[PDB]
Each structure stands twice: as structure tokens, then as C-alpha cells.
Design a protein around this ligand. Sequence first.
Ligand code: XO8
Ligand code: ADP
Ligand code: ADP
Ligand code: ADP
Lengths: 248, 746
Amino acid sequence: RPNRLIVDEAINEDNSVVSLSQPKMDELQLFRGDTVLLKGKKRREAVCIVLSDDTCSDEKIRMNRVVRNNLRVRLGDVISIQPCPDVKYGKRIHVLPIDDTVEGITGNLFEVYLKPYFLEAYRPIRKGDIFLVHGGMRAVEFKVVETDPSPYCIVAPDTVIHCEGEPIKREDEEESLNEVGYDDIGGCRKQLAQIKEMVELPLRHPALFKAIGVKPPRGILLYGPPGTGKTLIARAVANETGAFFFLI
Amino acid sequence: RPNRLIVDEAINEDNSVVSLSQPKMDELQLFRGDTVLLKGKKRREAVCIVLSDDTCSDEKIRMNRVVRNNLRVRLGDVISIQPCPDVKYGKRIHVLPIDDTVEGITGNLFEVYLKPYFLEAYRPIRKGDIFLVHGGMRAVEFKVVETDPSPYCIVAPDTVIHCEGEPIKREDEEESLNEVGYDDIGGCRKQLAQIKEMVELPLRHPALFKAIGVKPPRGILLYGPPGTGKTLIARAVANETGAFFFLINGPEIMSKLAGESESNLRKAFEEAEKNAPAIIFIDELDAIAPKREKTHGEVERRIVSQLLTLMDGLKQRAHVIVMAATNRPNSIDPALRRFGRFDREVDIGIPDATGRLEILQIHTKNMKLADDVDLEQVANETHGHVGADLAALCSEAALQAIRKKMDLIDLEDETIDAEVMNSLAVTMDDFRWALSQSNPSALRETVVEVPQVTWEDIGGLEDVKRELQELVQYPVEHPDKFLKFGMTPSKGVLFYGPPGCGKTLLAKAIANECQANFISIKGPELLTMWFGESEANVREIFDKARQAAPCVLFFDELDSIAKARGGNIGDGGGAADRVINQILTEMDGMSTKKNVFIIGATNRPDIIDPAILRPGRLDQLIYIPLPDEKSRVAILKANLRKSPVAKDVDLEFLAKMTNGFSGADLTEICQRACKLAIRESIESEIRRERERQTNPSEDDPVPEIRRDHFEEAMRFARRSVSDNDIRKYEMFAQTLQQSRGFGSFR
Ligand SMILES: C[C@@H]1CN(C(=O)Cn2ncc(-c3cc(F)c(OCc4nnc(SC5CCCCC5)n4-c4cccnc4)cc3F)n2)C[C@H](C)O1
Ligand SMILES: Nc1ncnc2c1ncn2[C@@H]1O[C@H](COP(=O)(O)OP(=O)(O)O)[C@@H](O)[C@H]1O
Ligand SMILES: Nc1ncnc2c1ncn2[C@@H]1O[C@H](COP(=O)(O)OP(=O)(O)O)[C@@H](O)[C@H]1O
Ligand SMILES: Nc1ncnc2c1ncn2[C@@H]1O[C@H](COP(=O)(O)OP(=O)(O)O)[C@@H](O)[C@H]1O
């Protein structure tokens, strides 16, 4: 059943790509780069782009933190897909930057950190979508407010993208959970995978641990030379799983 | 009189079985499986099933904690029996789960954790009965409310069992005393038995101890590596005997305000005293009372004195017992080691090879382990793992099984409990991972164990199997004769011979025969002490042997200290040295311990200082020669045993061709043969995989170690002893030997 799949960490990213397996994409009815129309959890969907790599195993779907945070999905969750290989263009795409990411940088953000991403990168353009572009020495992110096609659109120069205005505040009702995550952890992939397999279930699934009975690790003693990322990996495995992180 | 009997621990369990002895069941009027109609203490009876095993002794009746708690009986009590070999069936058996055991698991409990127990298991079905079934990863228990036959019924599909409803609350009026007990303690059966015989009477029978006069142990100092079960065994011997258990774990008190923590400890002792049978358990006593002179000040000593004045302040007529947990109590305050406060200091120690099997069995009760898993390979491979490590491995395997099934477990909104939990089936493939991903807690501690190398394994040497069986088994089996002729049994034996000739194997076999612990301090450990300028550590090792049961403290590869510095010649110093001298000094203390049988092993005896090989110390020299023809045949057969071998090989020819090879290098020849055989087998296996992958798309190219493999291994053999080296041992033997056959005149 290609409708539902369990999410996983992506490696290609591109701020937009969702990776499947061709032996599985055939069941998903996507071949080369067709639109995915990713279905989220609460009340949103993303167009996304289909691609493949080695780590699929025909079992899991991979999405970078841009999509995961856009769809309100934490790594390790289960989501749905609504494949639709169709092309439809928009004309009133309007975008505004996020104050949490623009709070002292001022300029032609339509040109300075936007040109190399609004075409040929296939941004998950859809009303309410939030995407990071990684511009000039800061992870500047934007939100596309209006997209007159939906939930999918062609990201191409034929589609019209309009200039932005003053920055808007981030949604504190959800906080967007930007912080950090697995995508900005490098050099300890094996250790991060060990911590993930060690801590994901008790944090994501506290319900079963009151019934399953077996005790999970009450505490995990990360250690290493100073500045190795212990705090970084702890905060990543906290935010990435949605667990509240209390630094003492 | 078969009516009344004293209860005891059961080993077969089955949640229902009550074990008697057939020579006693004949008096009980039960033969094969007849109903027992067990009679309890207050107002209840159980049907139970009769069976037998070894430990009955025609004196005691054995019941698992399910029956004991069902009948309101504590282990060590006296109960009655009302035999009635009759069959009567019921039709309105209704059961409900206990909320204390079901508080978050929801599903078809009539099917998920009930089917494999309501028939052919013979549950103690009777109105008011409570039974544990051990279902899906939790010790779920149920209570049968109504049983229209009573007090006995047939547990068979003819009898009708009905579906349950919402869970019911546990009876707080009695609390059911589930907690833990002896049945979930494994790997320290001897130590648990010692604690039971030490503590059962004062707790169960406080009445006599106000009249008996003799003081029981006011405090018991349990100790061992962390996670060994000290708290678990303390809580088991508390609950199992009905004694109130008060845990005052060190940090919980040391964390409170100075002076106020003293009051907290004092009022904890007052709480223990206000009720007579209570026992107070001091966990992590190292923190509370470390070495006095090593404490800094204020609390670290304010508590200790406050502890001491309370440790011995109790009059022992209040029936309060102060158990304690520590790690190698050489670290705790010596003042607490005095008598009247801590007079008994049993050593739990890490579980041995066959104890980890029992620990896994008890911990892997609810996991619903698959059939392909054995739990004996896991126990053997988990060398050095403490019981806590075994529990961690258990939990890791369970978590991996969940995590390899999260794909089909999170179908609904995460977990819905449900029957799905039975599907886990933790196969070996998950244990392997957990074992490989767990670090032994105590891998650098001298392990006390009963080795499982029997006399059969050590073939060949025979005069030494009877010249060594004598010294060990005669002064224990018939000590009366030895105290008649006046000789004191020789508590010392050193084996001198060619290197690698079974000295360790012979010592381990001696330990195995008389069910004795075997502490081997190999040569490298003695070198660690000698180089480290820490010969005082030797005092610990001997003590480690003293606190144990009959123990062949075995100084494997003795003289390594002297071998590491040339020896009696070639070095400025003499034969004596730090570690050997300390061993000599401490050995004289254990010359009157009458349970320890200090053994030595030396690959080069002539360098050993003769101060140790004189009466009292390792006086009795024993020579194990390099194996002879028949002995080499026996060694070959014994060390190729437990491994496939073809009929083509004839070990007699190999043995005779094996002209001058010791035991170690002969087993090396066998290992090389097996290594080449496994290489051939794996090469053939990968070639067969090649054939499978290619177009063509007989399964046993080499199902045993073949003969030409032995040929090639022997061609690859190597000998470690030369003519001069082997002659040196006999020349040394001449020092304490003679050929004075001239004095034939009686
Ligand atoms: C003043 C003295 C004495 N004297 C006497 O007239 C009185 N007298 N005569 C004999 C004994 C005697 C002493 C013992 F120490 C003893 O110990 C038995 C024992 N129990 N368990 C084990 S462990 C064994 C080995 C390892 C674990 C697995 C099983 N052993 C054991 C085994 C092997 C060797 N040694 C002890 C038994 C005895 F009979 N006292 C006069 C004399 C001139 O000098
Ligand atoms: N494995 C890593 N991946 C990415 N950044 C790292 C890593 N380890 C350290 N850093 C960087 O070093 C800084 C300190 O991180 P961390 O070691 O987690 O905190 P601390 O240095 O206080 O232990 C961070 O700003 C982080 O960007
Ligand atoms: N001999 C044993 N038998 C069964 N379980 C044990 C044993 N030793 C340790 N454990 C397990 O290890 C854990 C810790 O037990 P224990 O050592 O009594 O407490 P602590 O580790 O605080 O000293 C328990 O959950 C228990 O299940
Ligand atoms: N019947 C036997 N006789 C002698 N050695 C054997 C016998 N069976 C096996 N062995 C091998 O002998 C070795 C024991 O060597 P050991 O004599 O303890 O060395 P050392 O003499 O240095 O203490 C083991 O590795 C074992 O494989």
C-alpha cells in the first residue's frame, strides 16, 4: 500500500527532495521527477519532488528537516502520500521572510538569497509552506503565503513569483521547531544512529512503555573530548523527536 | 502423618505444580498427577497438582510463589494437605485480571495471555484463587472469582471458562505480597541459601529469640559488584519471609541537611523497630560509611558515628536486622566490620556460567522468546556480565524486537496494546546484537565459579587423577580416619611439568568433582601485583577465597614472578620476591581453613623458592609428565570430542606419530585441523553460493573434520618442549625423590 510510509532522514536534501526507491516508486506511480503531493499530519500537504538513493530499502521515505518541519512531522513518524504526476502553473506566488530568520539583515531578499532557489530547485511551493534557502551566512527561511494553484504547482520561470515586503513573525503557536536537528550533525553518524535507536521509542512512544514492561535506558552518558557535539547531538535528538529539552 | 508438611522452594513451578516424593506420595495417597487439594493457613485451599523431583528428601513440600501467595503462606511455614484423588468438572469458571498487573495493557486477555494456560497446565482453579500466567512482556496475573466445583476441579477443555470484563483492584487488605521473591533470583542459589539459613529464624520466629538466648546476626553485610542483585536478594528474603523491608539507600540520606540526615537515619531505625519483624537495608553503604581516615569531615563521619551508635545500639530483642550492600567491603569503615554490628558478610559475586542461564530464564519469562533461541549459548558468551548486565541484555533484545516490528506496530496511533505484543518473538538474531552491544560491568574481578570440566575431559594422566583425587576427596569423605592416624591433611599441591600439560585442567576438574569454587590467579595477575608495587592486593585474593565455599585457590602459572626476573640465577636478587613472599605469608593463615586446598602450577619449578614447598604450605609436589602413547590417544579423543569427526581418522596412528607433543600443542594440532576443515567448508559454501547465483541455480560438501585436514594440520604442527626441558623436570624431581630400594628390610 503506497498511501502510507514511515519517514526517515534524508542525505540529498536540496531543501525540497523527497527520496523513494524506483522498485517502490513504480508502486507510487512516479518515475523520474513527478510531483509527490506529500500529505502531512494535521492540515497541510507539500508538493515535493521524487528521487532515489541507496538507503531507501523499499521500506522508508526520506525527508530533510525543511519538509519535516513544514509538514509538522518529527523524524520517525508515519505519514501519507497522494501521488499525482501532473503539471500546473501558478501566477500569484507571494512570499515573505520569517522574522526569526531575518532580524537584522535587510536588502533585496527577492534577489540576494532567492534567485538560485525559485527555479530549477523545485521548492515545495504551496500556500502556508515554509522553506529554508540558506543564503548569505545565515539560514534565512521564508514562507510562501499565497499559491493560487494547490496543493501542487510548477516551480519554473513560467510561474510568476512576486516581491516580498516587511518581515513577518514566526508562528509561536507551533514555534516551527527550527533549532537544530540531525541534518546539521556530521562526523558521528554511527553514534547518532546508536542514540536514535536507543532513545527514539521511549520519547516518541511513551504509551507502550507503560504496557510493554521492559525498562528503557533511564539515562544515557554521552561523552567525548570537549566541543565534540555532545550538547548538539543531545539537542538534535531532543528536538528531532519532539521531546522537551531541559539543559541543566 | 501426611496431613501436615513444611513448605519449601520449588524449581519446576509451571504456576501450578506442587512437588512431593513418591516414597512420600504413597503415604499421601497420590501416584501420578492426582489432585492435592492443598490446605492453606486462614480460610482458603487450592487444588494444585502433585509431582516429584530430587530435592524433596521425603521431608518437605515445594510450592512456587504463585501458590504460596495464593494460600497466604510464606516460604518456611507449615501447612496442611487434604489429599483427594477425584475428578469433578465445572461449568461457570469466571476470571478477572488484577489491576495491579493490568494497568495499561488492553486487549482480548481471554485469548492473548490465557489460551496456553487454561488447559494442560492445570491452574489451581478455585473460587478466590489468584494465579500468574506470564503473558506478553509482563507478569500479568488473574483471579478466578467463581468456581462452581470446589475446592478441586478438572482443568480441561470439558470445563467451561468464560470471558472476563473490566480489571479489578488488588486486595489492599492483604496486598497479595507480589513484589519479588526467591523464584526470580538466579545465579546465586548458594548465597541465597546461606542468607536464608542465616536470617529465616530471627524474622519468622522472633518469639523464640527472646527465649533462646543466643544472639542471631544483628546485621548482614551483603556485597558484590554493582548490579549483582544485593538489593534484589535483600528484598526477596524480606518479602518471602513476610518481614517489612525498609530501604534507606545511602544517597537518599546523605543528600539531606547535616544533622537532619542523622535524624532521618535515626527515625528510619525507629520505624524498623516499631514493628518487630522488619528489616532495614542500607544500600550503597560505601557512601554512608567509607574508610574513616579517608573521610573529609562533618556528614561523612557524623553519619558513621550516628550509624554506629544505632548499628549496635539495637538490643537485638526488637527483632530488627540491618542488612547492608557494599562493594568489596575493604572500602567501608573498618569500625563497621566489628562483631555485634556486621558479623556475617556473605559474598554474592558475579553469576557463573550456568547461573547466567537461570538469570536469563527468569528475566526472559515474559518476552515470549522464540523457539530457535536457546539462552545457553547467550549465557556462555556473556562472560563477566553481572545480573544487571543480563537484565540490560534482556531489555535490549526486547527493544530491538519492538524496533524491528515498529513498521507493523505503529499502524494505528502508535501502540494500541492488543494481541500484537505476542508476535515479537525475540529470536537469537536479536540476542546476538544485544550481547555484542553490551559492555560487561565486572570483567576485571576474580570470578568464583564451579568449573564444568569433568574428569572425562582430562584424558591420559591417570596416576595423577588418583593421586590428586586422594588428597582432595579422602579428607572430606572420611575425615574420621585422618584424625585417628594423626596426620593432618595436606592443604597444598603444586603441579610441575612441561608447559601446557593440563595443570589448569586438572585443578578445574578437582574443583568440579567436589562441587568447589575455583579461583585462578594466573601468572599475569601476579606480575601485575609485582610490577605495580601492590603486593598487599594479594591479601584480598586470599580473602576472596576465604569468604567462599570449599575453594581450590589455584595459582596458575606460578613462578611467573621469578621467571620475569631471570630467576634464582642471572639476577642480583634471590629467589624470594614481593608477590611470592606475600603469597607465602598469607597462605600460612589459610593452613587452618580446612576448606581451601591451595593449588600451584609451574612450568619451570627449579626457580621456585623452596620456602613454599615445605609442610603446611604447598608441600606435596606432583609431577604430570608429557603424555604417553595411550595418554595422547585419550587426549586426542577428549579434545576432539564435542566436534564432528569422520570415521576415516584413526587417532592411534596420529598419537604415535605425535611422538613428543604436550597437551597444549596437541590441542593446537586439533584446532589447526578444525580451522582448515572450517576453511574448506566455508570455501565450498561460497562456491555453492556462486553456483546458486549463476545460471544453473549435495548440501554437505564437508559435514565433519575430514582426515586430510588432520594430515595438513599435523604437517603444520609445532612442539614447544625440547629434550633438555623435559629432562629438567625429572632432574628437579630427583631433588625430593630417592631410589633407596636397598632398605628392603621392612
Ligand atoms: C595438631 C595437628 C592435627 N592433629 C590431629 O590429630 C587432628 N586432625 N587430624 C586430621 C584433621 C583434619 C584437618 C582438616 F583441615 C580437614 O579438612 C577437611 C576438609 N573439609 N573441606 C575440605 S575442601 C576439598 C578441597 C577443595 C574443595 C573441594 C573439597 N577439606 C580438605 C580437603 C583436602 C585437604 N584438606 C582439607 C580434615 C581433617 F580431618 N585434624 C595432630 C597433627 C600432628 O597436627
Ligand atoms: N558533530 C558536530 N556537528 C556539527 N557541529 C558540531 C559538532 N560538534 C561540535 N559542533 C559545533 O561546536 C559547537 C559546540 O557544540 P557542542 O560540543 O555540542 O557543545 P559543547 O562544546 O558545549 O559541548 C557548536 O556550535 C557546534 O556547531
Ligand atoms: N541475581 C539476580 N537475579 C535476578 N535479577 C538480578 C540479579 N542481579 C541483578 N538483577 C537485576 O538487576 C537489577 C538491579 O538489581 P540489584 O543489584 O538488586 O539492585 P542494584 O543494582 O541497585 O544493586 C534488577 O532490576 C534485577 O532485575
Ligand atoms: N587431557 C588433556 N591433557 C592436557 N591438556 C589438555 C587436555 N585436554 C585439553 N588440553 C589443553 O591443555 C590446555 C591447558 O594448558 P595448561 O596445562 O593449563 O597450561 P599451563 O601448563 O601453562 O598451566 C588447554 O588449552 C586445553 O586445550
